[PDB]
Amino acid sequence: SWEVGCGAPVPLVKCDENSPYRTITGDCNNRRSPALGAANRALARWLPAEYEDGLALPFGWTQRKTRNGFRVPLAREVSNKIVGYLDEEGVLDQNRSLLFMQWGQIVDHDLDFAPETELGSNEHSKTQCEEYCIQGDNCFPIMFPKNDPKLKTQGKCMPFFRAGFVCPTPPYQSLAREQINAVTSFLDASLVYGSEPSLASRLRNLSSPLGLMAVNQEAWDHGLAYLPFNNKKPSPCEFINTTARVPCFLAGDFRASEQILLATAHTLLLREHNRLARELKKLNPHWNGEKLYQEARKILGAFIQIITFRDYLPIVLGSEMQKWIPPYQGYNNSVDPRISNVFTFAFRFGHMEVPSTVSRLDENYQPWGPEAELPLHTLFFNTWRIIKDGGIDPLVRGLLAKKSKLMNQDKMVTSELRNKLFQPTHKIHGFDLAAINLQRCRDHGMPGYNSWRGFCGLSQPKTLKGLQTVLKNKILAKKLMDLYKTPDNIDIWIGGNAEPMVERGRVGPLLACLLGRQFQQIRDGDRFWWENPGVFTEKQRDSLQKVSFSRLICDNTHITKVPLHAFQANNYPHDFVDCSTVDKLDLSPWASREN
C-alpha cells in the first residue's frame, strides 16, 4: 500500500526480499509499503498541521493575524521570562550521569533530521537575512523583544531559516506543508553508516577486503582510530580556532560535531565497528569484504536498540513505561514505523539536561590539567580539543563521573545554550536554542499545547487557576498566562516541558505519552528488531543480551575503571570496578561450518 504522496526526490531501488541485511536508505524494510520508514521522505503527521494560512505560513509570520484571538508572543520573549535563569548551583540531577543526556542525543539523531532548505551557497539570500532581518520566503527571523540585552550587542534579530519540505525544494506544491526527515526511522545506527548509498560508501575502506570503515590517517589516539576529517572546505571546526585549523569529522550523520561530547560518542561507535570486523574475520577467514561490513553493522545495530530500550527509556519514561510500551510480541506489518513531526519536538526535553560545563579527568578520575572544566559554549564544533589535547579517554571519563542537569521549573535551559549557541553557517557565539526550538514549532506547524493534552487523553486547562493545577505551580502558571493569553496557545515544547515530572521518570504526562507511543512504533514496526524471530539466532540473541555501554567503553579505550550502571549517578572509586570484571560480547555463535 505504498505510492501517492509525491514521487519526490527519493533515489529508486529494487528490493532483494531475501537479503538478511537492512538497506542503507531504509527502503524495503516493509514488504507491502517499501518506502514506509525510508530516509528523505515526509515526517509523519499524527494530527493536522496548524499554519496561519492553513497551508504553509507559520503562526507569528503575519503580525496582525491572531491565534484563537490573541497574538503569539515572540519566541525570544518566552525564552527570557520563562526559560533562562542565573544561579547554576543546586541544579544537577543527583541520580543521572552526563551520559544520560548524551545517549539521548545519539538516539534523537539516529531517528530524525529535518535539515534547512539550502538553495544557497553563492546566493545573497544567505545574507539578506543575517544583515537586515527582512522576513520573506525561507527566512523567518527571531526578532528581539524590547529590553533584551542582545539588542545592544548582536543586532535586531537572530537569523533563522524554515525547514526543508517534501516534494520540491524551492517554492511549493498544492496541499499542506510537510517537513523532511533526511534519515531513517528505524533504530539502525544510521548515524554511523550514513543514510544515502553515496555517503555510505565514502565512509568505507574499500581498498582492503577486511570490511573496515575508513579511519583517519593524519592522527591517532594511542594506536586507536579517529573518525576521518571532512573534505568540504568552508569548515566551522577550523573557524573556532584558525590557528590549529583542524576540520570537523566525517561520519554517517552531519551533526556529528555540534559538540565535543557528541563526536566523542561517535568515535566510540566507529571503533567497535572495525573491532567487530577484525574479530569476525578471524572466526570466518573465508568471509569477504561485503560480508564482514554487513554482519558487523548488523551487530552494532542490535547493540543500540538494546542499550536504548533496556537501559535508557525506563529512566526517561519512568513509571509510565509499561503503559505505553508493553512487552514485545513480534513483528507487526500494520504499524507505521515513521517518525512523527511532533516527536522531534517532544524529544527535545533533553535540552534542559545539558549542563553548563564539561570536564576532563585523568586516570585517577581527577582533574586533567589546569583548565579541565571548560564552559559548555566553548565546545561547539570543537575538534582540536580532542585531536590536539588529550584524546577521547579524558572526555569519556567525564561522561561517567559527572552528572546531568535536572529539569527544574524555576531553571530550564542553560545560558550556555540559551545565549551562546554556535551555528555552523554563521560566526558569533550568540544564538538561543530555546527561541530556535520555539520558532521551529511554529515553522513545523505544531498544534497548541491543548490539542496534545487531548490527544493523550489528559485534562485541558482553560483558566489561570486551571493551569496552576496541571503545572502545580502558581508563578509559572501566571507568567505562562500573561504571555500566551490562553492555554490553547502554549507551544508544545515549553508547554510539555513545564508539567512536573512523573514518578521515577524525567519527563511528565504529556511527553511520556508522546515519546512512549513513538518508541513503541519503531520497535513494533521494524522487520529487523533484534528480538524478532529470524533476524538473529536463538544463540546469538543470548550473547547480545549481555552487551553494556560499560563494556563498549572497555574494549574501545584505555579506561580500566568503569561503573556497572553507566546511566545512574555513580561516584569514584566506590561505584567503579575493573574492566576484567565485565561481561563480554561473545561472537562465537557467528561462526559458519561449511560442511
Ligand code: HEM
Ligand atoms: C548544543 C546541543 C546539545 C547539547 C550539547 C543538544 C542536545 C540534545 C539532546 C540531549 C537531545 C535529546 C534527548 C536533543 C534533541 C534534539 N536537538 Fe538538541 N542539542 C544541541 C543543539 C541543537 C541544535 C542547534 C539543534 C537545531 C534546532 C533547529 O530546529 O534548527 C538541535 C536540534 C535538536 C533536535 C531536532 C531534530 C531535527 O530533525 O532537526 C532534537 C530532536 N540540537 N538535542
Ligand SMILES: *[C@@H]1O[C@H](CO)[C@@H](O[C@@H]2O[C@H](CO)[C@@H](O[C@H]3O[C@H](CO)[C@@H](O)[C@H](O)[C@@H]3O)[C@H](O)[C@H]2NC(C)=O)[C@H](O)[C@H]1NC(C)=O
Ligand atoms: C537511580 O536510578 C537507578 C535506576 O532506576 C535506581 O536503581 C534501579 O532501581 C530499580 C527500582 O526502582 C531497579 O530496576 C530494575 O529492577 C528489576 C529487578 O528487581 C528489573 O527486573 C527491572 O527491569 C527494573 O528496571 C534496580 O534496583 C535499579 N536498576 C539499575 C539498572 O540499577 C537507583 O535506585 C536510583 N538511585 C537513587 C538514589 O534513587
Ligand SMILES: *[C@@H]1O[C@H](CO)[C@@H](O[C@@H]2O[C@H](CO)[C@@H](O[C@H]3O[C@H](CO)[C@@H](O)[C@H](O)[C@@H]3O)[C@H](O)[C@H]2NC(C)=O)[C@H](O)[C@H]1NC(C)=O
Ligand atoms: C587554539 O588551539 C591551539 C592548539 O593548537 C591552542 O594553543 C595550544 O595550547 C596551549 C596554548 O595555551 C599550548 O600548550 C601549553 O604548552 C606548554 C606545555 O606543554 C606550556 O608551557 C604553554 O604555556 C601552553 O600552556 C600549546 O603549545 C598551544 N599550541 C599552539 C600551536 O599554539 C590555543 O589556545 C587555541 N586558541 C584559542 C583562542 O582557543
Ligand SMILES: *[C@@H]1O[C@H](CO)[C@@H](O[C@@H]2O[C@H](CO)[C@@H](O)[C@H](O)[C@H]2NC(C)=O)[C@H](O)[C@H]1NC(C)=O
Ligand atoms: C584501509 O585498511 C587497510 C588495511 O588494514 C589499512 O592499511 C594499514 O595502514 C596502516 C597505516 O597506514 C598500517 O598499519 C599498514 O600500512 C596497513 N595495515 C595492513 C594490515 O595492511 C589502511 O590504512 C586503511 N585505509 C583507511 C583510509 O582507513
Ligand SMILES: *[C@@H]1O[C@H](CO)[C@@H](O[C@H]2O[C@H](CO)[C@@H](O)[C@H](O)[C@H]2NC(C)=O)[C@H](O)[C@H]1NC(C)=O
Ligand atoms: C498490529 O499493530 C496494529 C497497529 O495499531 C494494531 O492495531 C490495533 O489497535 C489499533 C489502535 O491502537 C486499532 O487501529 C485496531 O483496532 C487494532 N487492530 C486490529 C486488527 O484489531 C494491531 O492490533 C496489531 N496486530 C496484532 C495481531 O496485534
Ligand SMILES: [Ca+2]
Ligand atoms: Ca535511524
